[PDB]
């Protein structure tokens, strides 16, 4: 009755959950904005996902309150780089760290 | 209104400008000759372009005043090695360095 565990490449936070849809991504962006963090968009090749430094998509959205605008920017990033992994971050300037970071598209 | 920067491999001096035609290459050769430098031609595989030492095409043109001859030699090097990157150099004997260095053909 026991089931064997299927191994696959994982991608940190929220990677063990089913891929997020528009509603879940919007909820995450709303949480990041309500925490006072600045959303950011990054992308890299799937083989290069491990790098500490991702290609920066445009600029972090300082003072941005439009979750729809953040999602539209994510989709624009995906359109510009279809084959690249897409990650969403939230900069915490007070702690000099990221309050949230997860991959929107897992590459292909 | 904001568009992303498209990343691509860059090849040192004059690599951020559109590829030079015959007139621009001739002007560069004329400048190198007028500076008293000795033109030289090198070629390498594209994956090996980073190497400090390229395959040397014949010998540096010491005392050469024929810009057309130097351009013809560049084209002959291209014909001999169609798949190799082609670089033009100008030896500065007084400074023991290169007064000019740029890639004529970008590889393929």
């Amino acid at each position: 009755e026991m089931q064997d565990y299927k191994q696959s490449l994982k991608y940190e936070t929220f990677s063990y959950l089913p891929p997020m849809n528009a509603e879940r991504i919007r909820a995450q962006i709303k949480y990041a904005i309500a925490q006072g963090w600045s959303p950011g968009i990054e992308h890299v090749e799937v083989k290069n996902s491990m790098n500490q430094y991702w290609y920066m998509w445009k600029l972090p959205f300082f003072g941005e309150q439009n979750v729809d605008n953040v999602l539209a920017e994510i989709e624009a990033c995906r359109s510009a780089y279809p084959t690249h992994q897409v990650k969403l971050v939230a900069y915490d300037n007070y702690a000099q760290s990221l309050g949230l970071a997860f991959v929107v598209y897992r590459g292909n | 209104e904001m568009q992303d920067y498209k990343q691509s491999l860059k090849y040192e001096t004059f690599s951020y400008l559109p590829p030079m035609n015959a007139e621009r290459i001739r002007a560069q050769i004329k400048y190198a000759i007028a500076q008293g430098w000795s033109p030289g031609i090198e070629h390498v595989e594209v994956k090996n372009s980073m190497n400090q030492y390229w395959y040397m095409w014949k010998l540096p043109f010491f005392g050469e005043q024929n810009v057309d001859n130097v351009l013809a030699e560049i084209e002959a090097c291209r014909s001999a090695y169609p798949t190799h990157q082609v670089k033009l150099v100008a030896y500065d004997n007084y400074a023991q360095s290169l007064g000019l260095a740029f890639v004529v053909y970008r590889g393929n």
Binding site: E12, T13, S97 | -
Partner: protein, 444 residues
């Protein structure tokens, strides 16, 4: 004895070291007398003026009791507040401060019990100690982990595993989803398993798990040694093989050794996990000992990236304030005074980085929403039994714990009351995770 070492009028300087002692005196003895007694025996140790006393500035070089307060609910004890000049201690020596405070006062015969409740470290003395080698944010940057608490596991049994078998437990635990595994406080180098073989096989397992998962992995390799030379050798070998984190027992190993190891870790870029073994012989008795909040201050002064603080959920709802208070002491930059939470002094830390909070002991998937709500993202959750007792194995248990953690974090981010809706959230997550489902079935 009275007029000499206790001054009600004295206003303590911002550079003064302040200590709060819960004195349970012998019946009939004077409260001010006992306060001056703790102050004197912790600073000078005598009252009889000798000829060498007159060669010094007696008004300066002495500890003074400046305030006495009643203990709420305990008529047999009172609180003594004592101020110490910063000049009385070696700069940057938690060992010297600790010795000066607790060398002889606990052997006082005129009190039935003495507890050191809180100690105020001024920013001037704080700026001298090295503090945590890396800190929470720097460790997060190095490990590339954000937005969720870290997951750990203690490899069990404590006894019997060879190097390869211990490594083949660590490998499955890490490849299952835990960010870290943990060497036990007992395992430094035993005849059945030598430390070098431990380090080599553990590094092999960690590298294999990292390659097969895509996430940075680590193991708190224990470098507690009989000698500082052996400890430094083990830490250097861990760095040489590439281990990103090591572990030390800062009480049994010693404060001097812990400070030296923390300085070495800061120098060499190696993370330091701190275990609090023996802390119970000191901080458990309510009327005699030194509090774990004081021990936490001492540890963060000495240096460390992680520290065991308790599971919080392991106590009743009405007994969580002191644990939360010392959690804030460990993690936050400035902790205001809070008598309800047991914070007796305003504690300014300045720029010293915080230390990750470690929760370990008898906690599994069910406690997890409460653990997330209480600790926040800046904590490490350890699952020894909750991972090794999984019927499908260490990897399946780790996967269950990771799925539960991610689900709880997302639920908190969505604005849900994760403690109120914990069962629903975990069930919804288990609808996509058979390992998690069987984990709740096992530990219900």
């Amino acid at each position: 004895y009275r007029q000499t070492y206790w001054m009600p009028e004295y206003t303590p300087l911002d550079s003064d070291i302040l200590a709060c002692f819960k004195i349970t005196p012998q019946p009939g003895v004077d409260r001010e007398e006992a306060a001056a007694a703790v102050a004197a025996e912790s600073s000078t140790g005598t009252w009889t003026t000798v000829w060498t006393d007159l060669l010094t500035d007696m008004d300066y070089y002495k500890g003074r009791a400046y305030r006495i307060e009643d203990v709420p609910g305990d008529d047999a004890a009172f609180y003594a507040f004592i101020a110490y000049p910063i000049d009385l201690f070696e700069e940057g020596s938690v060992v010297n401060v600790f010795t000066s405070l607790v060398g002889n006062v606990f052997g006082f015969k005129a009190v039935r019990g003495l507890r050191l409740e809180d100690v105020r470290f001024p920013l001037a003395y704080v700026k001298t100690c090295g503090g945590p080698p890396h800190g929470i944010q720097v460790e997060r940057d190095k490990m590339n982990k954000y937005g969720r608490p870290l997951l750990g596991c203690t490899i069990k049994p404590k006894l019997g595993l060879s190097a390869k078998n211990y490594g083949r437990a660590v490998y499955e635990c890490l490849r299952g989803g835990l960010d870290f595994t943990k060497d036990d406080e007992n395992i430094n180098s035993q005849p059945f398993m030598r430390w070098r073989d431990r380090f080599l096989f553990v590094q092999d397992a960690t590298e294999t798990a990292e390659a097969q998962t895509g996430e940075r992995k680590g193991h708190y390799l224990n470098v507690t040694a009989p000698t500082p030379e052996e400890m430094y050798k083990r830490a250097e070998f861990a760095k040489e093989i590439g281990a990103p984190i090591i572990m030390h027992d800062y009480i049994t190993g010693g404060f001097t050794a812990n400070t030296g190891l923390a300085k070495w870790c800061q120098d060499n870029g190696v993370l330091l996990h701190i275990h609090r073994a023996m802390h119970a012989v000191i901080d458990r008795n309510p009327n005699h000992g030194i509090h774990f909040r004081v021990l936490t201050k001492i540890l963060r002064l000495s240096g460390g990236d992680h520290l065991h603080t308790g599971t919080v959920v392991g106590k009743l709802e009405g007994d969580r304030a002191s644990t939360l208070g010392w959690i804030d002491l460990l993690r936050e930059s400035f902790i205001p005074e809070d008598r309800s939470r047991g914070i007796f002094f305003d504690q300014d830390w300045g720029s010293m980085p915080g230390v990750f909070a470690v929760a370990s002991g008898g906690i599994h998937v069910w406690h997890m929403p409460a653990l997330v709500n209480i600790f926040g993202d800046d904590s490490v959750l350890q699952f020894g039994g909750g991972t090794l007792g999984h019927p499908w194995g260490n990897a399946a248990g780790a996967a269950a714990n990771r799925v539960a953690l991610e689900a709880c974090v997302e639920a908190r981010n969505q604005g849900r009351d994760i403690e109120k809706e914990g069962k629903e959230i975990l069930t919804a997550a288990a609808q996509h995770s058979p390992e998690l489902k069987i984990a709740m079935e096992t530990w219900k």
